[PDB]
């Protein structure tokens, strides 16, 4: 059964997450993704760490509410969907992070503030997901 597959279900057999199974469970978010309600999350790959330089990675963990911010992977509330809205302008949405995101999908691609995602729109059984391989900065 269970053939919908759920987040935390997705994060535990795909390795590709492993490190945010990781980071995420130390945080004690894994329960946060079982939780009942439809959430998008950006969840950069492995390709999205090569460059993270070493006092960067610190500055992040050296804070507790830095790398909270950034475990959240921009949360962010109601599944994300193109809006059937017109392709090739951006949208603007706010996270749970605090921040804003914004969207942009052309040609049939999911083009976020960033380039092209990996791998998104996976229908979870407590929202959706989206991968990308590029990590999210916050605002000034």
């Given at each position: 059964?269970?053939?919908?597959?759920?987040?935390?279900?997705?994060?535990?057999?795909?390795?590709?997450f492993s490190t945010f199974l990781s980071l995420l469970e130390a945080a004690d978010?894994?329960?946060?993704?079982?939780?009942?309600?439809?959430?998008?999350?950006?969840?950069?790959?492995?390709?999205?760490?090569?460059?993270?330089?070493?006092?960067?990675?610190?500055?992040?963990?050296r804070d507790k509410n830095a790398l909270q911010n950034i475990i959240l992977y921009?949360?962010?509330?109601?599944?994300?969907?193109?809006?059937?809205?017109?392709?090739?302008?951006?949208?603007?949405?706010?996270?749970?992070?605090?921040?804003?995101?914004?969207?942009?999908?052309?040609?049939?691609?999911?083009?976020?503030?960033?380039?092209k995602s990996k791998e998104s729109d996976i229908m979870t059984t407590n929202g959706?997901?989206?991968?990308?391989?590029?990590?999210?900065?916050?605002?000034?």
């Open positions: 059964g269970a053939m919908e597959k759920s987040l935390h279900e997705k994060l535990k057999q795909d390795k590709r978010l894994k329960e946060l993704l079982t939780q009942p309600g439809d959430w998008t999350l950006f969840v950069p790959t492995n390709d999205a760490f090569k460059g993270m330089t070493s006092e960067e990675k610190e500055i992040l963990i921009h949360l962010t509330p109601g599944v994300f969907i193109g809006k059937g809205f017109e392709p090739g302008v951006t949208n603007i949405l706010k996270t749970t992070q605090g921040s804003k995101i914004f969207l942009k999908e052309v040609n049939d691609t999911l083009l976020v503030n960033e380039l959706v997901i989206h991968v990308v391989d590029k990590l999210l900065y916050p605002a000034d």
